[PDB]
């Protein structure tokens, strides 16, 4: 059985940018088939409604087992409209968001939606005087490295893979939808890192990434004097750059012990595992 | 007046992952509106055809001024199907691809399509023993950093911005469609870097990135002994990691002179420019 | 005129460890004379009282113009005893402390005491399973670097030097006692860095250092499971190590422009100033 | 029983700055109680005499088991006055010093004093054109890192801990007083590093650090042309900065093997030990 | 049997600069004796002929068992003259060269000569506007690091050592002359590195060094506009600097496992082996 | 007119390895012609005598204007034989050596020989248990980087270029022979570095390199216990590695100001000069 899903991306988060690709990293899965629609970076009410309608139009013929909506702030107006449209729809749905999503966590459960809220997926320093396209991409490169090398992406991969198995068992109840809040302490329940200093450097990285959000928010929404806000948002980027260097450092530690966890998919969708570089994944 | 475009993403490249977002980095442009559809990482003929149909269905009501198709190897069968459907449609279309696209360069011009072929946008080490989702993300982070900090993304940004201005003049002829091949030497025609050592480090980073392709191709398509191919594809990732560090080091040299070029958009879509950290973009 | 002061150190903060030495960096000032007493790291009520008594006994003959008490948490019982004794004494006094001192800020003004509260002077990961003396010193080396290279110690140096000048004018009123809260944003009112990226790297370093406190507090005072709390306090130390790296990077940027601010004392106490390596301070 | 000691600090050395704190790193020992007194950075004959008298005055009621004098150059006139008063007093005494203390080593033994001379504890570049308070703190930060991560502070900690045990057996003869000269070669007699490269990197860092003294002495006491002496003292600081990195690199090696030695104190003053991050100290 | 050889150096390559020294690293071999002659950097026909004549004149009395000619491009005119003179001589001869030597590989075997062609031994950016003596030496230092720490110099050491043993067996047939082409993949057949990431980092270093050649060749022999060729050849040097860092990072990995391969000579010429730092080589 | 010289190399020093090549970096000088002879690493009396005889034999027909002998310790037996033979010959001669040559400095002037003694050209840790050919080459790469990037090679380049101009004026008196001792302080008389921190970093590097010699000597000639000498000589190599990193960091500083000094030769042997990357040397 081939599981089917539609991903909807409005605005951009590290996680929502990579979510579908984490699930079929070499395109050889024969057990999944995805459609991705979005309105690029725009996430106001009209755009989000238009994106969700695309999904729903496509769903009629595609018949997806579930739908995923990914982007910043589930509590904002645009994403709120999406939650509402998807809740009222026939399809099980999952919301991917960031720390601000916590404000509507209870609401989402009441709505019958799953969620994955990624606290370290921090808003960037979105002031015109600082953030051009190249800076926006550099920040995203640092963030992606943080979310990957600390193991956060593995947590997201797992959550969807478990859900895809349920989709293949043919009934997805609300009880099956993920309800995850991911942060620095998430790593304490996992066996991601063989070396405990690699773990605590990855924790520091997630801590700093999460702390980036408050700096950005202060610079974008609170401080009004550009003489103050430009430096403030630029300092949030210098942070994320260092979180990435910490995440890098953790990974090299795992390399030094020939212990880098890799969990690739087999063509039948099964998730394999290995540590040693020369060891076949199984 | 508002330019409209649909982006189609099948498979993944650093440039195709970011192309739409480079054009509206804070989501405040009032002069553009985009739709994005894709079949995620899958880019065989059926998936590509299904992706392009999504785009065309949506186009009926959306009425885009142009359509972009982005992903690996324009010469491959899936991307070949797309070029033909788009070349045969009523919509001006642009192909975003990598070095292997060079094989059908003349074909694409004959087809009446524009293209942007990014040679440093190198295929990764796609063998299951090595590439799991986290590794695929890590690679993508390094590559994004290279394409951003060396200024390749600015060349991309500029080509689409020029096209969007034409879309607003209301006629896009074949003469308007971009026809770009980007590589290490592209920097020599630009004024990206104020410091000439930042420039040559950035050139070294693009040269190493472009060299990664051959190593990945040897490891995925030529070498058949996994005792040899796993180290080979892994060494391609170590290369892209050091390319990213070179790009970083270049950008830090522009910092040391307070000379980082930023070219953000204004709400009306105009591209602004500045160098000094405290100077308003204009 | 020779100004005199007594410094009392109970417990240890980066700032209280260096406070007196920042005022006479080559021991050639002829206009100051200091005495320094303390009970080492112990800062419970009996020790703090004993420390302040030494100070007051010595003060009888020494006749200091002002007395400074420095160490962790002005709101804690030990430090609260010292504030009380110092407020009730005849000598103007200044409290050096960390973020937790903010809880008794209004109290201190009401007590007629000056203060300097250094938010980035963060508590370390004080769990026996992690913190031995070597780890404790490593943390203090990283923190000293942060507080020095970001310019925080320069803010402290100025505050006392202004006070010392008042002491020489012979009357210190409450109006003269410093009332400072130092943190990341402190750098925004200063001209410490010629290079604006050195400034924002230094702001990032201060932000991470202030963020370290919360991680330490969670690991020492909230989390009770040592399988959780050891990694937690260790991740706080990894953060401070990276903050030190940022502060270092900022300072190397100033070096690259031969713009490193130095403000040494002349023998008569006057504070000189220079930027260029070869330029005499004046 | 509770061992009591008074520390006297005149001038500054990395070792004298940290000596007392290395003995009670979390302030939970119930077996010791300390007083600290000093005249800050000033160490001429009259300051030192005043410092020592402070200690003697307090000692009448405090009744310490031993007194420690710490600061630069035991052979200098002020330190020499300290040795005279301490040698003549009733209290066992230890002298904490640097390499210049070697000139009065035999004298010290003849005086009945113990000593710990730390050759890597190098004089900084005390010229007004270069050394302001910030630069003095920066140096102290790199020095502290060197003395901590190479192990040197652990040799100190151990020596005082042994002495403290003899203080508790209630008689301290001259035979118990430490007589240590510490340098690069000290590591060869120890088991500080599990990894042999961490050791040799640590050795190199102590060698560079000891070499710093000669460059500082040349720049401060021999070269008289400021066009020569400013760059000379500045180069001594760049040395110490790289020594600090060597020491960091050594400790990261220990991390990679999960083999970082920690020897914390228990509440009763016993010195515990461990190597594995998760292992309880014992 | 003491084996005798003459080395001829015309032009410079990393390998030819170090070839003889790799065979007697502490000068304590009693089983070899060498003469070295050359014309420094000049390698045109006249100079090469003069160099080979020196060698042959000396050979009359010296009676070497074999002769080595080392330097750039065995296919160039100067080196072609040497191959002809050596082939026609009575002495077994080996040619050390770089990738361009591949054009005359078959020719050399037909000539009855041995060869070792080192692909990563890349031509530098020889344009007067960029390459002064200091730059030439810096590039050589990076290249030497690469060739050493990746294990390429060990391969060269072995080939000669095997030949030297044959020379002592008293007959060197053409069958004994080395016929090696060394590149990135050479590492796959060896057991140089205990850690597999050290290996792949070394492979990446060798790939980059090999890629340097093409960039230098483009900038020296193809591009004619100095506004383009100066940055081009400077970018080749930035590449080689990063290859050296990768090689360094590989070796530090081996240190982290106490597994650095060392194969020194014994006085009797026997090649010893060890991994652990404290283990006698055997 | 074309100046001619013979270089004799016995043993190895960073300077002697590069001395001839620093004089014709692209091989395009038409005003010089060189022969190079040596006995490789061996420098005992018989070998040195045999090397000097080769030179003198060749000199009969070559008619060199001067002869250079380069290698370790001009005071050792081998090199003493060379000095005597060269002093007694008809050819003006120059001795290239290291610090130990200082012992026979006066003797060399009495002998009528010139010299260049390079104190930072430090002996490596030549113990069999540590130094194999790869380690030997790694040390030489680090030292070469130090001697090049700090500007020491430029000093040597100048000295020979001045002598070469005299050789073309046709008479070389003893008054023309260089008599140089190079060390850290040599940089103070030069204008090598535009940035003063690059200068003091290069000084630090030369100080560390020069300090390496003492560590090597202790480990090779003094310490007899291999448990002590192996770590000792390996620590000298860690020092040289850090000295190379300081030299690198100095050069990157020069890059950040577009101020790297380049002094290439024109075809007629004239020494050109430039600082800006794009500026023609003149
Ligand atoms: C494309 C980007 N990619 C990402 N990628 C990741 N991973 N995470 C992200 O957060 C983002 N971004 C988050 N994004 C994001 C977040 C917040 C805001 C809101 C703005 O931060 C507020 O609206 C500021 O107030 C704008 O300030 C505005 O006002 C200032 C003065 O102008 P004036 O001259 O008009 O007065 C200017 O700086 C201007 O930008 C915009 C974009 C981007 C859409 C989006
Ligand atoms: C999602 C990834 N993101 C990217 N992102 C960027 N920026 N750039 C990229 O190139 C990619 N990837 C390119 N991708 C990509 C590219 C080429 C191949 C072709 C494969 O390399 C060939 O199919 C291999 O031959 C498969 O190898 C297979 O053969 C081995 C033996 O197993 P057996 O059990 O079959 O025997 C295993 O390694 C398995 O991996 C696959 C995926 C991914 C779809 C995609
Ligand atoms: C000497 C240090 N140097 C510094 N230097 C600087 N710059 N800044 C600092 O904050 C410090 N330190 C702050 N310091 C500091 C701060 C808080 C605590 C309190 C502790 O964090 C809590 O009281 C923990 O609960 C103790 O943990 C205790 O409980 C655990 C289980 O044992 P159980 O088995 O008895 O149950 C063990 O980890 C044990 O340590 C101690 C020391 C040090 C006194 C002091
Ligand atoms: C507070 C510092 N912290 C440390 N911390 C550690 N860990 N280690 C140390 O060595 C120190 N320092 C060692 N200390 C220290 C050591 C020696 C000198 C002696 C000075 O080096 C000589 O007395 C100079 O000659 C002064 O030079 C003087 O002469 C120059 C010309 O001016 P002009 O206008 O008078 O002619 C000026 O540069 C001036 O400083 C000073 C301070 C500092 C007190 C002290
Ligand atoms: C000394 C170096 N050491 C090495 N060491 C190693 N390890 N590897 C190497 O390749 C070398 N080098 C390679 N070598 C090498 C290689 C090629 C060329 C040929 C040059 O690349 C071309 O001949 C340029 O065309 C010269 O261009 C000339 O033209 C421009 C002025 O034009 P115009 O304005 O005069 O007309 C200037 O750039 C000038 O250099 C020279 C030397 C060096 C001799 C040699
Ligand atoms: C090849 C190297 N390249 C360089 N390159 C540069 N730039 N600079 C240099 O100085 C050198 N080296 C200096 N050279 C050099 C210098 C001194 C010694 C003297 C040796 O350091 C002593 O001869 C040791 O005492 C030997 O130790 C011997 O004893 C131990 C075994 O015990 P046993 O049981 O054999 O008795 C072994 O370590 C063995 O090597 C050797 C070589 C090398 C030939 C040469
Ligand atoms: Na603006
Ligand atoms: Na003094
Ligand atoms: Na350069």
Swiss-Prot record, chains A, B, C, D, E, F:
Gene Ontology terms, MF aspect: ferredoxin hydrogenase activity; methylenetetrahydromethanopterin dehydrogenase activity
Any one Gene Ontology BP term: methanogenesis, from carbon dioxide
Zinc as UniProt keyword: no
UniProt-listed Pfam families: MTD (PF01993)
Keywords associated with the record: Methanogenesis, One-carbon metabolism, Oxidoreductase
Pathway of action: One-carbon metabolism; methanogenesis from CO(2); 5,10-methylene-5,6,7,8-tetrahydromethanopterin from 5,10-methenyl-5,6,7,8-tetrahydromethanopterin (coenzyme F420 route): step 1/1
Region (Disordered): 254-282
Any coiled-coil regions, as ranges: none
Broadest EC class assigned to this enzyme: oxidoreductase
EC number: 1.5.98.1
Activity regulation field: Strictly dependent on the presence of salts for activity.
Reported temperature dependence: Optimum temperature is 75 degrees Celsius.
Catalytic activity line of the entry: 5,10-methylenetetrahydromethanopterin + oxidized coenzyme F420-(gamma-L-Glu)(n) + 2 H(+) = 5,10-methenyl-5,6,7,8-tetrahydromethanopterin + reduced coenzyme F420-(gamma-L-Glu)(n)
Function: Catalyzes the reversible reduction of methenyl-H(4)MPT(+) to methylene-H(4)MPT.
Record's subunit section: Homohexamer composed of a trimer of dimers.
Record family assignment: Belongs to the MTD family.
Protein name in the entry: F420-dependent methylenetetrahydromethanopterin dehydrogenase
Organism, as annotated: Methanopyrus kandleri (strain AV19 / DSM 6324 / JCM 9639 / NBRC 100938)
């Amino acid at each position: 059985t081939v599981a089917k899903a539609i991903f909807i991306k409005c605005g951009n988060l590290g996680t929502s940018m990579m979510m579908d690709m984490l699930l079929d990293e070499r395109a050889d899965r024969e057990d999944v088939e995805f459609r991705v629609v979005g309105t690029s970076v725009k996430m106001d009410p009209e755009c989000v409604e238009a994106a969700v309608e695309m999904a729903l139009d496509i769903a009629e013929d595609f018949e997806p087992d579930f739908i995923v909506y990914g982007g910043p702030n589930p509590a904002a107006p645009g994403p709120s409209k999406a939650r509402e449209m998807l809740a009222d729809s026939e399809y099980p749905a999952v919301i991917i968001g960031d720390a601000p999503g916590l404000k509507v966590k209870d609401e989402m459960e009441e709505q019958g939606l799953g969620y994955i809220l990624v606290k370290p997926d921090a808003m960037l320093g979105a002031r015109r005087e600082f953030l051009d396209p190249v800076e926006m991409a550099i920040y995203n490169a640092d963030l992606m490295k943080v979310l990957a090398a600390t193991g956060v992406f593995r947590v997201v991969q797992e959550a969807f893979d478990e859900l895809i198995e349920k989709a293949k068992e043919d009934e997805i109840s609300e009880n099956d939808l993920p309800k995850l809040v991911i942060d620095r302490n998430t790593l304490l329940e996992r066996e991601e890192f063989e070396n405990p200093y690699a773990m605590v450097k990855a924790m520091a990285a997630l801590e700093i990434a999460e702390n980036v959000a408050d700096v950005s928010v202060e610079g974008c929404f609170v401080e009004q004097d550009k003489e103050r806000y430009v430096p403030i948002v630029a300092s949030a980027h210098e942070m994320m750059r260092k979180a990435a260097e910490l995440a890098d450092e953790a990974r090299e530690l795992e390399k030094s012990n020939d212990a880098v966890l890799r969990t690739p998919h087999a063509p039948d969708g099964k998730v394999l595992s290995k540590r040693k570089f020369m060891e076949d994944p199984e």
